[PDB]
Amino acid sequence: AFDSTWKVDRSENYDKFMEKMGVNIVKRKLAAHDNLKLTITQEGNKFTVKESSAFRNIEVVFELGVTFNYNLADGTELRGTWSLEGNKLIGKFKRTDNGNELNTVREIIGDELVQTYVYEGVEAKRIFKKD
Length: 131
Fold this sequence. Notes:
Elements: E1 3-12, H1 14-21, H2 25-31, E2 36-43, E3 46-53, E4 58-62, E5 66-72, E6 76-85, E7 88-95, E8 100-102, E9 105-109, E10 112-119, E11 122-130
Antiparallel strand pairs: 1-2, 1-11, 2-3, 3-4, 5-6, 6-7, 7-8, 7-9, 9-10, 10-11
């Protein structure tokens, strides 16, 4: 099926990681308690990845090997690509303030939508579940 509401189940080094997005303390004092999700809904070989948080709902559409903008609610810019291979996604992003890459990655296992993030270094993981 892989077309669903998902929502955050767990997260790990998620504040460590946000600290190292060069977010700032008080973002985190709510990231603490903001949570994160998807409404994912693939279509003809494409991905409507409606990704969202207490910060703000983001529509992140892509069709396969496509580049685009993404922006935090605080006031940050970030752009990235996505593509689909072996029923799992491989994505990548980059600040344009720092000037660094971030390396996201999505996958649907266990009727559960894992994600994982890498900021210059720092592997976070986040795991989601259906709804």
